[PDB]
Symmetry: C2
Subunit: 69 residues, 2 copies
Amino acid sequence: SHMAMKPPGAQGSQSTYTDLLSVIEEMGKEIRPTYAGSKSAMERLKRGIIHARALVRECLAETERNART
Amino acid sequence: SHMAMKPPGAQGSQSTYTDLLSVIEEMGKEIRPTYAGSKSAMERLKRGIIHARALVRECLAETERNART
C-alpha cells in the first residue's frame, strides 16, 4: 500500500487505462444520490463496476507483460 | 456460460493489479445495502473507491512508462 498524501496527481498518459481511473471517480461521486434512494444513479453505479471489471480484465493482459516499477 | 471469466493468477506478473479486479467487485456488493440506506456499507463503498483509485494511480506510475492507448 501507499498513502499518497504527497501525490503527483496521476499523469499516467494512457487513455484506455485512464478510463478505469475515471470510472472509479464516476461511481465515487454517484454513491451519494444512490444512498439518497436514486435507483437511476444506483443502476449507473452498478454499470460502473461492470465497466471497471472489464477495464481491469483487459489491462491485466498487457500489465502482465509490463509489471514495471 | 456467462461473459465474465475470472482468472485468479495464471502468470505471477499482475498481482497488485489483480487486487484491484477484486476491489471492483467488492464495491459491487456494497451498492445494494448503500441504496437500502446503510451508511456503514455506503462508507465501505466510498472507501472502496478510495482503495480502487489509489490502485489505478499506483499502476499509472508504471503505465505512463507504457504507451499503447
